[PDB]
């Protein structure tokens, strides 16, 4: 997160960190807890190897350096990448992770509510984007969970700043005319949430942008309302 500040315990109880245990354990992507056994993230976080056991999912955490061998984590039981996602294109950048064990909901670890398929984002002005990603372009993973407040822009406005056809109706963008505040590498898969009438909704999944926090260059997110049929079909009881 570029131009953000430090979050507090319980502020973003749905935020998780997707880490891979290599020689050192490394945060690679964010995600959002959407139910006891389900995390929603970006499909491109899995562009490497398909191995599930390398991943550790941490929830109810604020600071990456606080994690030690005794810190609890979740494991992956299943990864479900959208059938239309291709590594070579930006579209359909969404994936579900089913955890091996259901997590209980506590003040520190709780789901973000999902929207409805047709309901509107026009009731929102500014939304919040969070993560441990870079704090500048070519920066480094941040230790303490960062938050930044950014206005949504229309898709017509967003498409002015990107190559034709790259911004679809299933994406939403957010940015400031003169930049300085945006998601960046390492925030991918995390939440863009908006609050209205005291209720938070998951509106976007951090996906991509041209650099980070440049002027006239809104960040691009997968629009969650446009995938609600897919999300409900894939997560339904067996």
JSON list of N, CA and C in Angstrom, two decimals, residues 5-15 60-62 107-112 128-130 144-148 191 193 195 200:
[
{"chain": "A", "resi": 5, "resn": "UNK", "atom": "N", "xyz": [-1.31, 4.17, 6.17]},
{"chain": "A", "resi": 5, "resn": "UNK", "atom": "CA", "xyz": [-0.83, 4.24, 7.55]},
{"chain": "A", "resi": 5, "resn": "UNK", "atom": "C", "xyz": [-1.11, 2.88, 8.22]},
{"chain": "A", "resi": 6, "resn": "UNK", "atom": "N", "xyz": [-0.62, 2.72, 9.44]},
{"chain": "A", "resi": 6, "resn": "UNK", "atom": "CA", "xyz": [-0.71, 1.46, 10.20]},
{"chain": "A", "resi": 6, "resn": "UNK", "atom": "C", "xyz": [-2.14, 1.19, 10.66]},
{"chain": "A", "resi": 7, "resn": "UNK", "atom": "N", "xyz": [-2.61, -0.03, 10.45]},
{"chain": "A", "resi": 7, "resn": "UNK", "atom": "CA", "xyz": [-3.91, -0.46, 10.93]},
{"chain": "A", "resi": 7, "resn": "UNK", "atom": "C", "xyz": [-3.85, -0.90, 12.41]},
{"chain": "A", "resi": 8, "resn": "UNK", "atom": "N", "xyz": [-5.00, -1.07, 13.06]},
{"chain": "A", "resi": 8, "resn": "UNK", "atom": "CA", "xyz": [-5.03, -1.52, 14.45]},
{"chain": "A", "resi": 8, "resn": "UNK", "atom": "C", "xyz": [-5.66, -2.92, 14.53]},
{"chain": "A", "resi": 9, "resn": "UNK", "atom": "N", "xyz": [-5.42, -3.59, 15.67]},
{"chain": "A", "resi": 9, "resn": "UNK", "atom": "CA", "xyz": [-6.07, -4.88, 15.92]},
{"chain": "A", "resi": 9, "resn": "UNK", "atom": "C", "xyz": [-7.58, -4.84, 15.72]},
{"chain": "A", "resi": 10, "resn": "UNK", "atom": "N", "xyz": [-8.15, -5.80, 15.01]},
{"chain": "A", "resi": 10, "resn": "UNK", "atom": "CA", "xyz": [-9.59, -5.89, 14.80]},
{"chain": "A", "resi": 10, "resn": "UNK", "atom": "C", "xyz": [-10.13, -4.94, 13.73]},
{"chain": "A", "resi": 11, "resn": "UNK", "atom": "N", "xyz": [-9.30, -4.03, 13.16]},
{"chain": "A", "resi": 11, "resn": "UNK", "atom": "CA", "xyz": [-9.83, -3.06, 12.22]},
{"chain": "A", "resi": 11, "resn": "UNK", "atom": "C", "xyz": [-10.31, -3.71, 10.94]},
{"chain": "A", "resi": 12, "resn": "UNK", "atom": "N", "xyz": [-9.54, -4.70, 10.43]},
{"chain": "A", "resi": 12, "resn": "UNK", "atom": "CA", "xyz": [-9.80, -5.38, 9.17]},
{"chain": "A", "resi": 12, "resn": "UNK", "atom": "C", "xyz": [-9.72, -6.89, 9.43]},
{"chain": "A", "resi": 13, "resn": "UNK", "atom": "N", "xyz": [-10.71, -7.43, 10.17]},
{"chain": "A", "resi": 13, "resn": "UNK", "atom": "CA", "xyz": [-10.66, -8.81, 10.70]},
{"chain": "A", "resi": 13, "resn": "UNK", "atom": "C", "xyz": [-10.76, -9.91, 9.63]},
{"chain": "A", "resi": 14, "resn": "UNK", "atom": "N", "xyz": [-11.14, -9.53, 8.41]},
{"chain": "A", "resi": 14, "resn": "UNK", "atom": "CA", "xyz": [-11.19, -10.40, 7.25]},
{"chain": "A", "resi": 14, "resn": "UNK", "atom": "C", "xyz": [-9.85, -10.50, 6.49]},
{"chain": "A", "resi": 15, "resn": "UNK", "atom": "N", "xyz": [-8.90, -9.60, 6.73]},
{"chain": "A", "resi": 15, "resn": "UNK", "atom": "CA", "xyz": [-7.64, -9.59, 5.97]},
{"chain": "A", "resi": 15, "resn": "UNK", "atom": "C", "xyz": [-6.79, -10.80, 6.34]},
{"chain": "A", "resi": 60, "resn": "UNK", "atom": "N", "xyz": [-6.12, -12.95, 11.67]},
{"chain": "A", "resi": 60, "resn": "UNK", "atom": "CA", "xyz": [-5.97, -12.40, 13.00]},
{"chain": "A", "resi": 60, "resn": "UNK", "atom": "C", "xyz": [-4.56, -11.93, 13.32]},
{"chain": "A", "resi": 61, "resn": "UNK", "atom": "N", "xyz": [-3.84, -11.38, 12.31]},
{"chain": "A", "resi": 61, "resn": "UNK", "atom": "CA", "xyz": [-2.49, -10.86, 12.50]},
{"chain": "A", "resi": 61, "resn": "UNK", "atom": "C", "xyz": [-2.39, -9.41, 12.01]},
{"chain": "A", "resi": 62, "resn": "UNK", "atom": "N", "xyz": [-1.50, -8.67, 12.62]},
{"chain": "A", "resi": 62, "resn": "UNK", "atom": "CA", "xyz": [-1.25, -7.29, 12.28]},
{"chain": "A", "resi": 62, "resn": "UNK", "atom": "C", "xyz": [0.16, -7.09, 11.70]},
{"chain": "A", "resi": 107, "resn": "UNK", "atom": "N", "xyz": [-13.35, -11.49, 17.56]},
{"chain": "A", "resi": 107, "resn": "UNK", "atom": "CA", "xyz": [-13.26, -10.05, 17.26]},
{"chain": "A", "resi": 107, "resn": "UNK", "atom": "C", "xyz": [-12.08, -9.75, 16.35]},
{"chain": "A", "resi": 108, "resn": "UNK", "atom": "N", "xyz": [-11.10, -10.67, 16.31]},
{"chain": "A", "resi": 108, "resn": "UNK", "atom": "CA", "xyz": [-9.89, -10.48, 15.52]},
{"chain": "A", "resi": 108, "resn": "UNK", "atom": "C", "xyz": [-9.95, -11.17, 14.19]},
{"chain": "A", "resi": 109, "resn": "UNK", "atom": "N", "xyz": [-10.89, -12.11, 13.98]},
{"chain": "A", "resi": 109, "resn": "UNK", "atom": "CA", "xyz": [-10.95, -12.92, 12.77]},
{"chain": "A", "resi": 109, "resn": "UNK", "atom": "C", "xyz": [-12.41, -13.14, 12.40]},
{"chain": "A", "resi": 110, "resn": "UNK", "atom": "N", "xyz": [-12.92, -12.40, 11.40]},
{"chain": "A", "resi": 110, "resn": "UNK", "atom": "CA", "xyz": [-14.33, -12.39, 11.03]},
{"chain": "A", "resi": 110, "resn": "UNK", "atom": "C", "xyz": [-14.46, -12.22, 9.51]},
{"chain": "A", "resi": 111, "resn": "UNK", "atom": "N", "xyz": [-15.48, -12.70, 8.79]},
{"chain": "A", "resi": 111, "resn": "UNK", "atom": "CA", "xyz": [-15.67, -12.52, 7.36]},
{"chain": "A", "resi": 111, "resn": "UNK", "atom": "C", "xyz": [-16.10, -11.11, 6.98]},
{"chain": "A", "resi": 112, "resn": "UNK", "atom": "N", "xyz": [-15.79, -10.77, 5.74]},
{"chain": "A", "resi": 112, "resn": "UNK", "atom": "CA", "xyz": [-16.30, -9.55, 5.13]},
{"chain": "A", "resi": 112, "resn": "UNK", "atom": "C", "xyz": [-17.58, -9.97, 4.38]},
{"chain": "A", "resi": 128, "resn": "UNK", "atom": "N", "xyz": [-11.70, 1.56, 1.24]},
{"chain": "A", "resi": 128, "resn": "UNK", "atom": "CA", "xyz": [-10.42, 1.30, 1.91]},
{"chain": "A", "resi": 128, "resn": "UNK", "atom": "C", "xyz": [-9.77, 0.06, 1.30]},
{"chain": "A", "resi": 129, "resn": "UNK", "atom": "N", "xyz": [-8.45, 0.16, 1.11]},
{"chain": "A", "resi": 129, "resn": "UNK", "atom": "CA", "xyz": [-7.65, -0.95, 0.55]},
{"chain": "A", "resi": 129, "resn": "UNK", "atom": "C", "xyz": [-6.54, -1.21, 1.55]},
{"chain": "A", "resi": 130, "resn": "UNK", "atom": "N", "xyz": [-6.30, -2.49, 1.86]},
{"chain": "A", "resi": 130, "resn": "UNK", "atom": "CA", "xyz": [-5.36, -2.87, 2.92]},
{"chain": "A", "resi": 130, "resn": "UNK", "atom": "C", "xyz": [-4.41, -3.99, 2.44]},
{"chain": "A", "resi": 144, "resn": "UNK", "atom": "N", "xyz": [3.88, -3.98, 9.09]},
{"chain": "A", "resi": 144, "resn": "UNK", "atom": "CA", "xyz": [2.59, -3.72, 9.71]},
{"chain": "A", "resi": 144, "resn": "UNK", "atom": "C", "xyz": [1.53, -3.48, 8.64]},
{"chain": "A", "resi": 145, "resn": "UNK", "atom": "N", "xyz": [0.39, -4.18, 8.75]},
{"chain": "A", "resi": 145, "resn": "UNK", "atom": "CA", "xyz": [-0.77, -4.04, 7.87]},
{"chain": "A", "resi": 145, "resn": "UNK", "atom": "C", "xyz": [-1.14, -2.57, 7.66]},
{"chain": "A", "resi": 146, "resn": "UNK", "atom": "N", "xyz": [-1.10, -2.17, 6.39]},
{"chain": "A", "resi": 146, "resn": "UNK", "atom": "CA", "xyz": [-1.35, -0.79, 5.96]},
{"chain": "A", "resi": 146, "resn": "UNK", "atom": "C", "xyz": [-2.78, -0.64, 5.45]},
{"chain": "A", "resi": 147, "resn": "UNK", "atom": "N", "xyz": [-3.30, 0.57, 5.62]},
{"chain": "A", "resi": 147, "resn": "UNK", "atom": "CA", "xyz": [-4.62, 0.94, 5.12]},
{"chain": "A", "resi": 147, "resn": "UNK", "atom": "C", "xyz": [-4.52, 2.28, 4.38]},
{"chain": "A", "resi": 148, "resn": "UNK", "atom": "N", "xyz": [-5.30, 2.41, 3.32]},
{"chain": "A", "resi": 148, "resn": "UNK", "atom": "CA", "xyz": [-5.42, 3.69, 2.61]},
{"chain": "A", "resi": 148, "resn": "UNK", "atom": "C", "xyz": [-6.87, 3.85, 2.09]},
{"chain": "A", "resi": 191, "resn": "UNK", "atom": "N", "xyz": [-8.43, -7.19, -0.01]},
{"chain": "A", "resi": 191, "resn": "UNK", "atom": "CA", "xyz": [-9.71, -6.49, -0.11]},
{"chain": "A", "resi": 191, "resn": "UNK", "atom": "C", "xyz": [-9.65, -5.02, -0.54]},
{"chain": "A", "resi": 193, "resn": "UNK", "atom": "N", "xyz": [-12.73, -2.66, 0.37]},
{"chain": "A", "resi": 193, "resn": "UNK", "atom": "CA", "xyz": [-14.01, -2.68, 1.07]},
{"chain": "A", "resi": 193, "resn": "UNK", "atom": "C", "xyz": [-14.57, -1.26, 1.15]},
{"chain": "A", "resi": 195, "resn": "UNK", "atom": "N", "xyz": [-17.91, 1.09, 3.05]},
{"chain": "A", "resi": 195, "resn": "UNK", "atom": "CA", "xyz": [-18.90, 1.11, 4.13]},
{"chain": "A", "resi": 195, "resn": "UNK", "atom": "C", "xyz": [-20.01, 2.11, 3.80]},
{"chain": "A", "resi": 200, "resn": "UNK", "atom": "N", "xyz": [-20.03, -2.81, 6.10]},
{"chain": "A", "resi": 200, "resn": "UNK", "atom": "CA", "xyz": [-18.95, -3.04, 5.15]},
{"chain": "A", "resi": 200, "resn": "UNK", "atom": "C", "xyz": [-19.31, -4.08, 4.08]}
]
